[PDB]
Coordinates of C-alpha atoms and ligand atoms in Angstrom, one line a residue:
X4 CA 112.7 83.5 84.1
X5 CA 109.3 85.0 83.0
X6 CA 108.7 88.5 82.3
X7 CA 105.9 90.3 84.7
X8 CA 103.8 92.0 82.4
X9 CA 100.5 93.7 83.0
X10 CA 99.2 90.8 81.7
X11 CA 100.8 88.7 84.4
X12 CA 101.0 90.4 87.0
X13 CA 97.7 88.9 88.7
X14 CA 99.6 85.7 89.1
X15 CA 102.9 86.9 90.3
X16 CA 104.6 85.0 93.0
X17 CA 105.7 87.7 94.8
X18 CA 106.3 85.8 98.6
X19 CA 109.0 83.5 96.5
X20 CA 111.1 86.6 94.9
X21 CA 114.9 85.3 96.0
X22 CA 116.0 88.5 96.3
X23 CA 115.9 91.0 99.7
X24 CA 116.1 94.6 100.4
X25 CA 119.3 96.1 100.8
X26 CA 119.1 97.7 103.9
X27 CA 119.7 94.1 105.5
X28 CA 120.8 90.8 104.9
X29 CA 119.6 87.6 105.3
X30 CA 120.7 84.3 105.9
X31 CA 118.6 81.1 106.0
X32 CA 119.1 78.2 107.6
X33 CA 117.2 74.4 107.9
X34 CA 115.8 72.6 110.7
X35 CA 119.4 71.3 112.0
X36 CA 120.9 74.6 111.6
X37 CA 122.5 74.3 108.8
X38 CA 123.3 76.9 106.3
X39 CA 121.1 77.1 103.2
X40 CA 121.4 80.2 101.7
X41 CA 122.1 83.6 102.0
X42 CA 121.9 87.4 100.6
X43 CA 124.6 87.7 98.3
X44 CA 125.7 91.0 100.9
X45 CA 126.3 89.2 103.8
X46 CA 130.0 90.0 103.5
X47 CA 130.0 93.2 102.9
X48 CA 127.2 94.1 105.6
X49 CA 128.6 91.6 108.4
X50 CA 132.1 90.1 108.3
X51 CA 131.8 87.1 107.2
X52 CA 130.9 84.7 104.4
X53 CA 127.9 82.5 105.3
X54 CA 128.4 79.5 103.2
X55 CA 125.6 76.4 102.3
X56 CA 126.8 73.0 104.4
X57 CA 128.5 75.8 106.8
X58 CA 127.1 75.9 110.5
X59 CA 127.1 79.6 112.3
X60 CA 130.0 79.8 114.2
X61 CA 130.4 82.4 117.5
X62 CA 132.0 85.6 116.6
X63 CA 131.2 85.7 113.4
X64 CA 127.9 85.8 114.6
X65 CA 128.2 86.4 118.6
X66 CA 126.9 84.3 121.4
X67 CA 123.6 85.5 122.1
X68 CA 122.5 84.9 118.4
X69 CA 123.0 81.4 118.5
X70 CA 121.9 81.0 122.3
X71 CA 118.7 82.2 120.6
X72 CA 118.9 80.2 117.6
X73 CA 118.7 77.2 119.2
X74 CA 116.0 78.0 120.9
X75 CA 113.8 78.2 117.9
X76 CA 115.7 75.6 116.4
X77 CA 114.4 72.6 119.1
X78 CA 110.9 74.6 119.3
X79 CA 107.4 72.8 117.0
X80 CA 105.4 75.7 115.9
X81 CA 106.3 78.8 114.3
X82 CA 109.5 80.7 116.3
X83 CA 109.6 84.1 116.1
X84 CA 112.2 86.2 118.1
X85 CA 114.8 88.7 118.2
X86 CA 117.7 90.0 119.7
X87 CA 120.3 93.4 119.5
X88 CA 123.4 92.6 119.7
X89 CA 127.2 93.3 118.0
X90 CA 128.8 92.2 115.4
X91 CA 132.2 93.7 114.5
X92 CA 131.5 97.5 114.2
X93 CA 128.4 97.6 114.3
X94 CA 125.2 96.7 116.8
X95 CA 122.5 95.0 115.2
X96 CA 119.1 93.8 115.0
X97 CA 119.1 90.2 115.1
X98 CA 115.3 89.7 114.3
X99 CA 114.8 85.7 113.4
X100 CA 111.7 83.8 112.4
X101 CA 110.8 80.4 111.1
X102 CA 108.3 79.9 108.3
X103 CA 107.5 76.3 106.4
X104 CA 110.8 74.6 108.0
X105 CA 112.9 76.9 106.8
X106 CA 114.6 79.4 109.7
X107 CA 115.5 82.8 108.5
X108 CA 117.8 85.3 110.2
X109 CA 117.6 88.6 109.1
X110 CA 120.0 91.4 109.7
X111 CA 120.0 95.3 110.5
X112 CA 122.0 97.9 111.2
X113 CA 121.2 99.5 114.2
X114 CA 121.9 103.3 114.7
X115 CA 119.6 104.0 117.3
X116 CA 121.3 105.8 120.8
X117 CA 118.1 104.3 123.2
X118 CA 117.7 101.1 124.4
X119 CA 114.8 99.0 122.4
X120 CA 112.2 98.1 125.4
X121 CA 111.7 101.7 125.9
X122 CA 111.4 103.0 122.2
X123 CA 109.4 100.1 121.8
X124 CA 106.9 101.0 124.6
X125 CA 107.2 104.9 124.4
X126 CA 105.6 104.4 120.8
X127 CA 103.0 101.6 121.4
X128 CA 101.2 103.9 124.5
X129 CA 101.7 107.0 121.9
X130 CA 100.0 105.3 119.0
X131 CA 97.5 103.6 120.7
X132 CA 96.1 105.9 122.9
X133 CA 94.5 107.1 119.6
X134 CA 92.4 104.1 119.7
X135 CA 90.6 104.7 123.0
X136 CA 89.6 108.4 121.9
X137 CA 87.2 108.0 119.7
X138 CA 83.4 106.6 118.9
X139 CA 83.0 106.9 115.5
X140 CA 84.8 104.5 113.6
X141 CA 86.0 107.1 110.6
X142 CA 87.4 109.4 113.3
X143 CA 89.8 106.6 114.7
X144 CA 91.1 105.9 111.1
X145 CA 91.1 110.0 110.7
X146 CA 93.5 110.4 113.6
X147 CA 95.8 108.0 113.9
X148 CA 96.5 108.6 110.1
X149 CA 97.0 112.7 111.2
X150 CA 99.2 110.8 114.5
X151 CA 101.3 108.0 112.3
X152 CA 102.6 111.5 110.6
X153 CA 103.5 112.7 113.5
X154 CA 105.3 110.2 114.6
X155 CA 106.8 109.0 111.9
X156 CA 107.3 112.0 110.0
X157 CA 106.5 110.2 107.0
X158 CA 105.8 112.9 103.9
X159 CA 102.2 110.9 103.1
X160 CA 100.3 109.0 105.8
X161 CA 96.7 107.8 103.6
X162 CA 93.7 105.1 105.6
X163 CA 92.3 102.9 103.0
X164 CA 89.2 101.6 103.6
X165 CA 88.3 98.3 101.4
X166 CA 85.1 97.5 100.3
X167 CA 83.2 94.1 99.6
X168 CA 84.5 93.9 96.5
X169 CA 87.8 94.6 97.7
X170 CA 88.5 97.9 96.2
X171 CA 89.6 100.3 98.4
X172 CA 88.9 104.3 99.4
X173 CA 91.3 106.5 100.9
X174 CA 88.9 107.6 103.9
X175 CA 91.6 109.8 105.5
X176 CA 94.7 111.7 104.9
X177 CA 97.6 113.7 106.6
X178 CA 100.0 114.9 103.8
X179 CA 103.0 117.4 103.6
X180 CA 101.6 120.8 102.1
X181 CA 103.3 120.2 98.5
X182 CA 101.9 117.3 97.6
X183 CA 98.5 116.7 95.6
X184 CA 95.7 115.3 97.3
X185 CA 94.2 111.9 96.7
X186 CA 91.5 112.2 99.3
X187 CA 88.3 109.9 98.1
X188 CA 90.4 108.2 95.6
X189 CA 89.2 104.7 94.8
X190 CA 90.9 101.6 92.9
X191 CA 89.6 98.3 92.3
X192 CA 90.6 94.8 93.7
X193 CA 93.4 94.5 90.9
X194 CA 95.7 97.2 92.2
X195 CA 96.5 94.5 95.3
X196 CA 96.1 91.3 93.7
X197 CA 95.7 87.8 95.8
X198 CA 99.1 87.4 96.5
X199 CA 100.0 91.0 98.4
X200 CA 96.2 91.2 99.6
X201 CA 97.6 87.6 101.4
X202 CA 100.7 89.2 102.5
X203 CA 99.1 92.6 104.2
X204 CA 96.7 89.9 106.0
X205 CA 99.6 87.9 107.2
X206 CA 101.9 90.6 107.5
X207 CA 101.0 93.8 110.3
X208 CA 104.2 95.7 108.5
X209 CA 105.6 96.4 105.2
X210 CA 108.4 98.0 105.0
X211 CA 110.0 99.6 101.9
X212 CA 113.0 101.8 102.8
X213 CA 114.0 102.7 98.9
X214 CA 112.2 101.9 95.4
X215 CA 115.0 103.2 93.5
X216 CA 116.9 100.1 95.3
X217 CA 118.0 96.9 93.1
X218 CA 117.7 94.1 94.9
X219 CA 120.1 91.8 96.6
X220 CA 119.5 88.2 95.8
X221 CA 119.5 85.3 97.9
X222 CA 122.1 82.3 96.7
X223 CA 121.2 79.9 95.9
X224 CA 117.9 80.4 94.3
X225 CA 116.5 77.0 94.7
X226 CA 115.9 75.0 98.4
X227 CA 118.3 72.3 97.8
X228 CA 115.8 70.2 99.9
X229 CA 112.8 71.0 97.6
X230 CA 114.1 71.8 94.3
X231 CA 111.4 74.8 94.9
X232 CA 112.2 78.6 96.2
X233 CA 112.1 80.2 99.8
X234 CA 109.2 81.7 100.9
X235 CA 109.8 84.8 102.3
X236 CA 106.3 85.5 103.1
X237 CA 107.4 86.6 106.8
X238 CA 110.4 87.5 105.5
X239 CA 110.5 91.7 107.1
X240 CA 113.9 92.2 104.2
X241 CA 111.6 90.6 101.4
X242 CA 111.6 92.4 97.7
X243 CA 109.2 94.3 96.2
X244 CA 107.6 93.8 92.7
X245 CA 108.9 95.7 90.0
X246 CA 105.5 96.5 88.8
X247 CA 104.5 98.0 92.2
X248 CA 108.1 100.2 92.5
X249 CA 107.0 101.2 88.7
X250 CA 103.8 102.3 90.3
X251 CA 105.4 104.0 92.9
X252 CA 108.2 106.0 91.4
X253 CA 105.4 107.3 88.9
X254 CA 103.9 108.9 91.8
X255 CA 107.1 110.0 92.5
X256 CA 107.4 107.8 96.1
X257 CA 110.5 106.4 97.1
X258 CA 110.2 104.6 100.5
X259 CA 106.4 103.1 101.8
X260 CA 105.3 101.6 104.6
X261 CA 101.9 100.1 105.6
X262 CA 100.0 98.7 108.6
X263 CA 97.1 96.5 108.3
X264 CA 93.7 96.3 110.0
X265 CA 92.6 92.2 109.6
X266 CA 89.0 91.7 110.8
X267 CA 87.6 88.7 109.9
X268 CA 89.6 86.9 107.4
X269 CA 89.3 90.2 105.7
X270 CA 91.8 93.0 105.0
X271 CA 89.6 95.6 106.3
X272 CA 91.9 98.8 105.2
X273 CA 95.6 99.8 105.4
X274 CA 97.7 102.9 106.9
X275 CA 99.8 103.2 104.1
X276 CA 102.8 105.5 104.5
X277 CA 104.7 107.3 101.4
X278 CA 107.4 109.3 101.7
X279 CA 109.5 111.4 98.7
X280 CA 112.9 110.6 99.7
X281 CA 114.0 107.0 101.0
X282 CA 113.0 106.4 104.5
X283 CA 113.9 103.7 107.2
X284 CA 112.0 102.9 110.6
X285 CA 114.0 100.8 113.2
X286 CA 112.6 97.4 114.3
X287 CA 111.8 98.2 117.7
X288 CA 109.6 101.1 116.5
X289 CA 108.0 98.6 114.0
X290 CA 106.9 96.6 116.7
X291 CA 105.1 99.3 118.1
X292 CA 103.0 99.3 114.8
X293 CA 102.7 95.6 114.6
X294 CA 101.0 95.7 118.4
X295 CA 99.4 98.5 117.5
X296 CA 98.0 96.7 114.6
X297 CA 96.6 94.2 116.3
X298 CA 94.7 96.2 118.8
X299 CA 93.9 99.1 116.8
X300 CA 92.0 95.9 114.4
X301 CA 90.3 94.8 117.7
X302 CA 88.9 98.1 118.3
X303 CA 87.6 98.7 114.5
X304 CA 86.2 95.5 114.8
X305 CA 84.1 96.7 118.0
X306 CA 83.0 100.1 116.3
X307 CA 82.3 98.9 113.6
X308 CA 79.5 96.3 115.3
X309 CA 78.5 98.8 117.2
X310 CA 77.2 100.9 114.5
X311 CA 75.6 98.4 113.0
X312 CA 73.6 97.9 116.4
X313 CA 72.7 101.7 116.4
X314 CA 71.2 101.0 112.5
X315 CA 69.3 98.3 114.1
X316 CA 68.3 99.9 116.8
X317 CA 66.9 103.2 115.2
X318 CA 65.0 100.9 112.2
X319 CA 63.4 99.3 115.1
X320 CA 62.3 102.3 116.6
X321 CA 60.8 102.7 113.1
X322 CA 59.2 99.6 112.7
X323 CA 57.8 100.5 116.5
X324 CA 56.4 103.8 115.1
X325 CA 55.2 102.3 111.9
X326 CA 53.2 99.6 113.9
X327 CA 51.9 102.5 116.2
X328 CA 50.4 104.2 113.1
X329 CA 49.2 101.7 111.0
X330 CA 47.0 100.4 113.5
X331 CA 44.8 103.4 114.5
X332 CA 45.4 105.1 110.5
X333 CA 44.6 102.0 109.1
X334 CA 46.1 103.0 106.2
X335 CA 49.3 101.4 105.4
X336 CA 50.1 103.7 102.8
X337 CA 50.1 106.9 104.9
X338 CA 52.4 105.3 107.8
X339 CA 54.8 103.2 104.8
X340 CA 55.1 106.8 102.9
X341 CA 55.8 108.8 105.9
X342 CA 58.3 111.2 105.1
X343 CA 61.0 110.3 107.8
X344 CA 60.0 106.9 109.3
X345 CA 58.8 105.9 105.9
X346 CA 60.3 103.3 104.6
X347 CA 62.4 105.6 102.4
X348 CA 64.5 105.9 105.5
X349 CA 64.7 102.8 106.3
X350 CA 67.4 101.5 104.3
X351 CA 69.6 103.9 102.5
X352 CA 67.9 104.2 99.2
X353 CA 67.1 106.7 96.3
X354 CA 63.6 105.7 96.1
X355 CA 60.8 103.1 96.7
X356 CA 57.7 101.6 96.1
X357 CA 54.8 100.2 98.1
X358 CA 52.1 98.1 96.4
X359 CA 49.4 96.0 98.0
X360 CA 46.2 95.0 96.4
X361 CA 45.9 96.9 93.3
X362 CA 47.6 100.4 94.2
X363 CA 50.8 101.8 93.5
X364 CA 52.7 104.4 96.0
X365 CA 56.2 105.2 94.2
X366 CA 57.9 107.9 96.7
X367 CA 60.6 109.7 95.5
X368 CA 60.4 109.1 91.6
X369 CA 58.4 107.0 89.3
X370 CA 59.4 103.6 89.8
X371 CA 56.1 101.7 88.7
X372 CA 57.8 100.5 85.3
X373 CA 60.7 99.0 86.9
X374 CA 58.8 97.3 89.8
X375 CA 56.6 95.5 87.3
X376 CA 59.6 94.5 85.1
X377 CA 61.4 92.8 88.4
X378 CA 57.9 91.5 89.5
X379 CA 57.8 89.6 86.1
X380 CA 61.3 88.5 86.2
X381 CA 60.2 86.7 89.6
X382 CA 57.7 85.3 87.8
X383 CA 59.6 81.9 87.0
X384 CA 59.7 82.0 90.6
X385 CA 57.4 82.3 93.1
X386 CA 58.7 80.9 96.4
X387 CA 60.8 83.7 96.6
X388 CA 60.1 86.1 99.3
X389 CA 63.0 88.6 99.0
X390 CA 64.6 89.7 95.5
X391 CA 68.0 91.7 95.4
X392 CA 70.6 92.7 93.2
X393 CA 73.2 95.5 92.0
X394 CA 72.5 94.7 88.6
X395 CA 70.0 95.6 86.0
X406 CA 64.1 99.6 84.0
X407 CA 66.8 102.5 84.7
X408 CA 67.9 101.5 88.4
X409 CA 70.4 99.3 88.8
X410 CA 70.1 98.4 92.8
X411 CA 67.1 96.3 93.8
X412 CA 65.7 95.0 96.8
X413 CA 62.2 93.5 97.3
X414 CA 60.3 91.7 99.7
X415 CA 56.9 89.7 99.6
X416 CA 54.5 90.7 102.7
X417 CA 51.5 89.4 101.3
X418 CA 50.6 86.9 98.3
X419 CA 47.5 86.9 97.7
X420 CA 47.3 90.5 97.0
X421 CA 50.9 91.0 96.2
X422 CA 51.5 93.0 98.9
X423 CA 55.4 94.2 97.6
X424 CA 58.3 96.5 98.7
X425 CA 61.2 98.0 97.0
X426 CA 64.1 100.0 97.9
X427 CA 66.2 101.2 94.7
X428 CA 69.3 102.2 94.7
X429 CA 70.9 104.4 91.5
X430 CA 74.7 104.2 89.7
X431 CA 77.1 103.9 92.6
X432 CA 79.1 107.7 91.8
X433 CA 82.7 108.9 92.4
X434 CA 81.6 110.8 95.7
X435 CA 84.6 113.1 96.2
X436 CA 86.4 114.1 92.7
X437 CA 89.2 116.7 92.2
X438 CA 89.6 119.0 89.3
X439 CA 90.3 122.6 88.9
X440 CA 93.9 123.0 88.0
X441 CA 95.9 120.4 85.6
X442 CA 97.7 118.5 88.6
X443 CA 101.5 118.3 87.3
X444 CA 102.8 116.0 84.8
X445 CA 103.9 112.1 86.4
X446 CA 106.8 110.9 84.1
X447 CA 105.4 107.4 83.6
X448 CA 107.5 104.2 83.3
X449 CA 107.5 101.5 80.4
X450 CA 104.2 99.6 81.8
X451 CA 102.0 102.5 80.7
X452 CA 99.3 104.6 82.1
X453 CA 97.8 101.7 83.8
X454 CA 100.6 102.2 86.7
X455 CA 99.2 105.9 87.7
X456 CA 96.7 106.3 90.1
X457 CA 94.6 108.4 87.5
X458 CA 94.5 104.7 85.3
X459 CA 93.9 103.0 88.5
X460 CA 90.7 105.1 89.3
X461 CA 89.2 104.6 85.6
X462 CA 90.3 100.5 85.8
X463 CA 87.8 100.9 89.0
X464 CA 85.0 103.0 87.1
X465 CA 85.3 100.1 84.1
X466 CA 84.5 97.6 87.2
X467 CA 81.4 99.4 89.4
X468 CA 79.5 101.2 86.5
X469 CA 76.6 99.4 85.6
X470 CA 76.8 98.8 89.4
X471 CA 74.7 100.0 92.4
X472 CA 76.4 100.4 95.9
X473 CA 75.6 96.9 97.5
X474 CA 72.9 96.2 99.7
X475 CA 74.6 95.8 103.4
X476 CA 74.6 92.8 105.6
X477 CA 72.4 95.1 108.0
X478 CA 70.0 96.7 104.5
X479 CA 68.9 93.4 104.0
X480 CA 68.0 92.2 108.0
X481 CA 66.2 95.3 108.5
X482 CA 64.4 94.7 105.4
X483 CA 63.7 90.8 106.6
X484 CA 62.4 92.0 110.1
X485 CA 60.1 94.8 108.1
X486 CA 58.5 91.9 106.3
X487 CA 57.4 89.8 109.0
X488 CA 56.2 92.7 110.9
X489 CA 53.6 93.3 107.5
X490 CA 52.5 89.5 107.3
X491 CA 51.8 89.6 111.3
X492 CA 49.8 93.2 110.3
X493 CA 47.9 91.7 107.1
X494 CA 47.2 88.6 108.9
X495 CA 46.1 90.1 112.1
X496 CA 43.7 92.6 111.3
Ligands
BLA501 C1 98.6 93.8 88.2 C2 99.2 94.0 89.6 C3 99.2 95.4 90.1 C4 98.7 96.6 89.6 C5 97.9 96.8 88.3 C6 99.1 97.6 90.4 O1 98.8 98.8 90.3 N1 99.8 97.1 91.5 C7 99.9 95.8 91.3 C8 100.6 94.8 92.2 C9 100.8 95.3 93.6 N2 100.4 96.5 94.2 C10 100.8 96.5 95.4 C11 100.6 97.5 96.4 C12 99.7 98.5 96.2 N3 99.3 99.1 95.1 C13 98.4 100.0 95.4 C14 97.6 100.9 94.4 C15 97.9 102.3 95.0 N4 98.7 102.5 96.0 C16 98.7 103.9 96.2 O2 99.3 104.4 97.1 C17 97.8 104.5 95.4 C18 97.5 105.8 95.3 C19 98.2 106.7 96.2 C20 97.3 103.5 94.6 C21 96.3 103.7 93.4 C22 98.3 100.1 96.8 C23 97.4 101.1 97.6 C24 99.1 99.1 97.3 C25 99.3 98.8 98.8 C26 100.6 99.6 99.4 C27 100.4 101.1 99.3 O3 99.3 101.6 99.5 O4 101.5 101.8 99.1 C28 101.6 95.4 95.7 C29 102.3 95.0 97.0 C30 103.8 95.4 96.8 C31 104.6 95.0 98.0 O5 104.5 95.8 99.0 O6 105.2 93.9 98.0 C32 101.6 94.7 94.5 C33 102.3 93.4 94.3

């Protein structure tokens, strides 16, 4: 019965809400095939009154509906299907899944004129075609977010890209003329707590035809089998929290829709889709997003790797030219401090610092204080051969490595106060009216929740930073040692 406050609402159990869209209706059934519960609009959307203890019975829900019901019903491990077909006045889509041991039968009205397979495969070469266009991984998010608006027509189309620390970017944008911009906008983790970052991952499509909408709940509330609710995690009809619709009507949205991109166990980044009036997108066509989904997160995957190899690659190419001039210099210094091989550019950095024997070369500031201050801190521990952090002189991004001990051969990259890259201003944007919940809810409170989180913060130092920095080090020892 609990209130969602903004104080809650980190723990809200939002796959276990009861309650369904109402552009559907939903009935759920148990293993045998017996009635449960159901939408409490059932009767007025299809013609008849699913009861709990009832069975389905033909015409009231056609043929084909149960022919494929029991299908799922005698299948072990997670049925998923669907079907078209008529019921009464109306042709519907039938689409059915099975999550826990619960079976779920959702309901749509279908007004489409073509026939499904084709809409379904007329969209998926459209959409995906996008995905074999392009090299660099930010053009692929950049037009398919431009294409999803073609297609869909959708007022707002954004690409979120989340970081590490799961707070996300919007990387790309295709947006009706009208509308402010919110290109480069970043919120933190909080704005998608566990349980919807869980969903997106599970779930290629979200689907919210009308915020405005009050919901249509589910009778009864409680599984009679468990005393416990229905979870409706892959439940398409499935409510949305009131805290998010808050959110969204303060921006003035009215229908969303999102497609994930899971690599890893990770939610890499969303095509999240606004639009200003309510908005519906039939099932077939959904499908066409949830292939596309899955490929388009296979592809990301692949660019994304093969930057990373072109990092390696090039820093190699380095270390090749830095071992070429060190030797016949003989000078470490000269080849380490080289303006464009030099180690400067060899990780992303705003400075760094070379020190063996008793000399000093800061390059690109004076960074002598800090170095000495970490060099202390590692005092209280001297097996350590690499040091890094985002924390902390008047850096906050560290990363050092040990080359030689003797003569405390050291390197350091630093990295600065990670910094709103892209930031809008100019003109007072127009006034949001803003719900009960409070400012928190706009995306102007999101963006200073996620300044409150990162300041104090360098950028972190990547998977890739820290092996170049590895194979750099052993590449000094094997010089030091050598000759
Ligand atoms: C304390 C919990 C929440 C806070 C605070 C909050 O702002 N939202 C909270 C819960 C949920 N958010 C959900 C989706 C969601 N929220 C955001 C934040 C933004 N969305 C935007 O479009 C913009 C700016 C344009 C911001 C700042 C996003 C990006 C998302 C994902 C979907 C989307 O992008 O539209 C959410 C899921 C709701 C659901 O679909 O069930 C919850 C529970």
């Amino acid at each position: 019965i609990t209130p969602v406050t903004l104080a809650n609402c980190e723990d809200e159990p939002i796959h276990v809400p009861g309650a369904i869209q109402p552009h559907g209706a939903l009935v759920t059934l148990r293993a045998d095939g017996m009635v449960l519960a159901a939408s409490e609009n059932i009767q007025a959307l299809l013609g008849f009154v699913a009861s709990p203890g009832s069975y389905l019975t033909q015409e009231q829900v056609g043929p084909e509906v149960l022919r494929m019901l029991e299908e799922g019903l005698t299948g072990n491990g997670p049925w998923s299907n669907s079907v078209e077909t008529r019921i009464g006045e109306h042709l519907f889509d039938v689409i059915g899944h099975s999550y826990k041991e619960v079976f779920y039968l959702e309901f749509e009205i279908r007004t489409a004129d073509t026939l499904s397979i084709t809409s379904f495969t007329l969209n998926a070469q459209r959409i995906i075609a996008q995905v074999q266009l392009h090299n660099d991984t930010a053009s692929l998010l950049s037009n398919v977010t431009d294409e999803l608006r073609r297609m869909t027509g959708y007022d707002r189309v954004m690409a979120y890209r989340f970081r590490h620390d799961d707070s996300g970017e919007v990387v790309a944008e295709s947006r009706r003329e009208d509308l402010e911009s919110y290109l480069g906008q970043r919120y933190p983790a909080s704005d998608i707590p566990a349980q919807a970052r869980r969903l997106y991952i599970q779930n290629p499509i979200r689907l919210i035809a009308d915020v405005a909408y009050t919901p249509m709940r589910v009778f009864p509330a409680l599984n009679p089998e468990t005393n416990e609710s229905f979870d409706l995690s892959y439940s398409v009809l499935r409510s949305v929290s009131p805290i998010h619709c808050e959110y969204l009507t303060n921006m003035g949205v009215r229908a969303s829709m999102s497609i994930s991109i899971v690599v890893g166990g990770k939610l890499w980044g969303l095509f999240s889709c606004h639009h200003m009036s309510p908005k519906l997108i039939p099932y077939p066509v959904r499908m066409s997003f949830q292939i596309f989904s899955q490929v388009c997160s296979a592809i990301v995957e692949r660019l994304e790797q093969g930057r990373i190899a072109e990092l390696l690659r090039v820093s190699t190419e380095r270390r090749l030219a830095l071992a070429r001039r060190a030797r016949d210099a003989d000078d470490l210094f000269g080849a380490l401090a080289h303006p464009d091989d030099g180690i400067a550019a060899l990780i992303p950095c705003d400075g760094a610092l070379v020190m063996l024997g008793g000399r000093t070369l800061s390059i690109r500031g004076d960074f002598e204080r800090q170095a000495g201050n970490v060099l202390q801190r590692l005092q209280r521990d001297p097996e350590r051969d690499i040091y890094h952090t985002d924390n902390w002189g008047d850096c906050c991004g560290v990363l050092a490595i040990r080359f030689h001990r003797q003569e405390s051969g050291w390197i350091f990259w630093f990295r600065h106060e990670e910094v709103h890259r892209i930031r809008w201003g100019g003109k007072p944007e127009k006034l949001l009216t803003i719900g009960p919940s409070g400012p928190r809810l706009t995306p102007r409170g999101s963006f200073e929740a996620w300044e409150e989180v990162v300041r104090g913060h360098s950028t972190p130092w990547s998977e890739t930073d820290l092996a170049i920095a590895e194979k750099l080090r052993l590449d000094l020892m094997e010089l030091c040692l050598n000759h």
